[PDB]
Design a protein around this ligand. Structure first.
Ligand SMILES: Nc1ncnc2c1ncn2[C@@H]1O[C@H](COP(=O)(O)OP(=O)(O)O)[C@@H](O)[C@H]1O
Ligand SMILES: Nc1ccn([C@@H]2O[C@H](COP(=O)(O)OP(=O)(O)O)[C@@H](O)[C@H]2O)c(=O)n1
Ligand SMILES: [Gd]
Length: 208
């Protein structure tokens, strides 16, 4: 696989886990676009920047030199060379990230970072196969029921299922504009499947 594989989908549909495993099986990096959006949100919070102040936020992001590090075991985001990854997957970041991700300048900043990577790679996000890498040779859209996505996510947050579900429903709703599947994406419902099964299906499709 020498081109680009995109994997898009709503929260907890399985994108990061599948992209990591598929990329490792193909011998290429994977790029988690949401990690950059999460970093943008985390930095704005930490800096006391008003979430509607695009200019100030962009001044900060470019000013700090924020970078995505694609490592096989998982992506990392650095700001001024320092690893912020451990702070990006909190309920707090989950709850405010959509508001920051809606800013045109932030999306343009994230996409510039993604476009700096030479192919091949597998990229996961909301609009990888539509807005960012529409030329991708292999596109996938993962989806599952809100209940199972909330069930999966609750295992990864200091929150119970019902709150996780409420939060997930809201976030996916707030992400609607950037979340439609590419028309040529293979849509897979991952509910009821193991990570291994989804990876196997995706690789089989890629290797058709
Ligand atoms: N069939 C599956 N496919 C992918 N991930 C799964 C699956 N079943 C359970 N998981 C768990 O659900 C979580 C999904 O997280 P993640 O890979 O980040 O998905 P997403 O990027 O869509 O939020 C992981 O904890 C993963 O281990
Ligand atoms: N390409 C994408 C990727 C992420 N995002 C935003 O970034 C936030 C986090 O993405 P994420 O993929 O890390 O979230 P999860 O699906 O991993 O739970 C999201 O809710 C989206 O608002 C986005 O607008 N567009
Ligand atoms: Gd993820």
């Amino acid at each position: 696989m020498r081109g680009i594989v995109t994997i898009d989908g709503p929260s907890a549909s399985g994108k990061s886990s599948v992209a990591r495993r598929v990329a490792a099986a193909l011998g290429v990096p994977y790029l988690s676009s949401g990690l950059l959006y999460r970093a943008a949100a985390f930095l704005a919070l930490r800096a006391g920047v008003d979430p509607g102040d695009e200019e100030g936020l962009l001044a900060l992001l470019e000013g700090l030199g924020v970078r995505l590090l694609a490592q096989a075991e998982g992506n990392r985001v650095l700001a001024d060379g320092e690893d912020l990854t451990s702070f990006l997957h909190t309920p707090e970041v989950d709850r405010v990230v959509s508001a920051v991700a809606r800013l045109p300048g932030v999306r343009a900043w994230v996409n510039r970072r993604l476009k700096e990577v030479p192919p091949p790679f597998v990229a996961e996000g909301r609009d990888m196969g539509t807005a960012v890498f529409p030329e991708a040779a292999h596109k996938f859209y993962l989806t599952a029921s809100p209940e199972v996505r909330a069930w999966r996510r609750a295992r990864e947050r200091p929150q119970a299922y019902e709150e996780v579900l409420r939060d997930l429903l809201r976030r996916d709703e707030r992400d609607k504009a950037q979340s439609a599947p590419a028309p040529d994406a293979l849509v897979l419902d991952t509910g009821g499947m193991t990570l291994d099964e989804v990876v196997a299906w995706v690789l089989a499709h890629i290797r058709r």
